[PDB]
Amino acid sequence: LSNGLGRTPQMGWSSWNHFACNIEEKEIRETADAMVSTGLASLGYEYINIDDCWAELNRDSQGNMVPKGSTFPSGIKALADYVHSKGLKLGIYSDAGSQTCSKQMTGSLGHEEQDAKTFASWGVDYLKYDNCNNENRSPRERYPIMAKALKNSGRAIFYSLCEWGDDDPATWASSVGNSWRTTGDISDNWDSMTSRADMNDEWASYAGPGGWNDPDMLEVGNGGMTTAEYRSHFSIWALAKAPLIIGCDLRSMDQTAHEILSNKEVIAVNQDKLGVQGKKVKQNGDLEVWAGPLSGKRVALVLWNRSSSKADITAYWSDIGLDSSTVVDARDLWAHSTKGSVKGQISASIDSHDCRMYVLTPK
Template structure:
């Protein structure tokens, strides 16, 4: 009922994945304390299977990289108190063409995943037969339901047919964008495209602007803070995409910001929206449980620092409301009380994030 949190192999490892990396990543989720904060899914992406099915048409784990098999891997991940995710495509092949897809094998593959102990399925959209996603994706929905095992179903059809409009009847999250790349322009463009569908997010069904790039090296620390902050207030899945085994303290500090995670996991489940855009200055805001609001003040300029004003009537606070403000990255409650507006100094390609709690 809240956005999923975990890790996926694709953004950092691409096809260079094996069972040792997956096991060590599960270990790292526990040892870094991220598992206790809610990161529970350890997800294989493309390239985990052999190119050909067995004689009975079943998936076969790639012997060179997963010699112990997926069931043994799931058992290990479960022993750590975590969950294992897997990947397939609603087509005849996966996007790298290195393994078969699940088109026309939905029930067989769903039963295989369930028998292995899979907890999450990312379902891609490559090499299909020309039929629409709204035809192919529900087939896997029915197949997963038929197994009787709870499996989170992540629709990865790239925003092809506006999945936010129908995804809640088919899966648990839906990709509204093409793949993210580890740079500022890609990150903010995915955030913008995802924000359009904010009203469709709700407990049990989430807009997905793709996985996190934090820790992969293509952005500055401030830019990664913006990345994590927007994903969190957007109630997006928080799926880590770096090599956690060697993650820096700065990376872990971003991914492990409990106050920002709490916004993402807030039970009200309402996605924040842009409420003002003035040049490079933006205000994003959304309601939280307990009559609170989260406010993100963003500076998209790469050169200039701005004083940016967040007006409470834009955010949705009633006139005359006095609030206290909690800075989620400085981890401090501001001494001043605010009425009508809050002003923040924001550096280039940076943001400030506050939770506003009414006191009158």
Template structure:
């Protein structure tokens, strides 16, 4: 028995030695396959065609939208991506296997459009799918064509790729998505990689080496229940967000008309404090003043773009009343007081919940009123909120 035990121990030692020799190679290979493109150090900001236009897109509308991003001043406060969603390509590839822009709606091709957008100082995004066809089934997906499509996108000057998850071969996203990651890394152009896997297999847990953002929820709709549920579903993954890789709650619905002004303010506030991509989904060519006021709030955007990149967590829930909080740079804390209920209510943020010493005195900046409150606060801060509304503060300790 002693000899056998020694033989087993010796065999195990040999196996471990081999594993240790291979480990550096495995790690090196893993790092080589990671999406090290230097993009997404803060959440991306821009616009996407799907929420408002669906498949009703064309070259003129995309050009006019790029014009609007500049003329409205959105580009000056960080909105830079103009993203084309589904339905832009012909149903069949050309005889070389390349994707072909739909002639009837993009007569001059995507490269010419990208050049136009770039001359505006903006970036152009495009859409594909990790399946045989996209979700609309009106154009091919990139499955089995990843390298060819990545090189095509790079040659056109594409800056952002939204990659959906429809009509697949049945394999797991953890198998299919990294293939496009590697293809993009070899394409010769940095392209922001947005994984649109809808949160089915918890992409927050594996997305960091694969993409720059990952959808944690199914598609959003322009109503309160859909919007607030997406925020809830995403919040549990807060620890996975960091510079270079972000949890994505789907595009913004602000300005599409399905919610009240207060509800849209909640929508924009929760996306901002959650460090979500701020991708507008309305028609930028005819926005109302109320919509403009919401999406151009520089103070709220600054929270979203804070270099520390900490995503907010719900730190207290009492019925319909919630407190969301996240640390910011310069020792500050961002706090959203939220009333999800049907009636007016008084809501309190307590220092113990948001990570402050109970004796700390703070200065409170109201980000929607654009004013610093005269009163300094110690221990807690209380606000009275109407139905489906919020208050958004940045708290700064007073030395």
């Protein structure tokens, strides 16, 4: 959606993956404080997204969504104002439905323009729009009603369709919103994360600046996956131009979690000007190669070892879109070291569930 937003994939954080429905403004503010405190804001992470359970089941007397009086007593403007003053942006959540998926707060079905105008007046910068309790109506019908409500509100609001890949969003959502969930919810474990990545791969050619495929919120730091797994996870999402929405607790991030998310050479792949979604190109069993072009005639590339044991993986250059006779310098993004004059292939011995990520720069 050309609303000036999401020219690269959104970077930020959402409450959902770590806190689920147990949420309050105090935690939202401290989270934003940590986004600055821990340097994440200066690497590009700007969105502080409040997910489900922020509002009341009922609306106020004038038909408006009421922030939950017990957990958000200062209101949502107050919170947006705080987040803006920290150089950041605030997101909220609602549903293309009568209630949200948790059934703990109302939705925005039949109140789309009124909710977009309220949001705008609060200084909201992002909206995640879930797909529960939808009274058996098409996502092609309900989702545009809110796209156009946002457009006609006061301000520029990033629009995140959350409709779990029903009716293949990629095919119609580019002109509707800034990103679309391609799969059902991620959980903090390997089989989940990987299946999200696989499911998302087939929609690679539909994603550009303005409109990203969304394999769901990062689970890095939540403790149900290994360091190696998380390295891959972040790595693949980066390459696949996924939203990079952190989903652990910023206020208590594990040092390895933080380190993984801070690799700015990987971030620059995700945030690459060219805005082409990298993808699986090659599959030697559980040994995979994923690749994609970058700006300046470069190539981003992951060697991924989904085996249960240690393995050699080889990315041939026919696999990843180069003449074999081309020579490159090969930047290893995690080791932060360059290797000169690599020619037809690169190889590595890689640990179980771990990966190598490179950026290939021609001479």
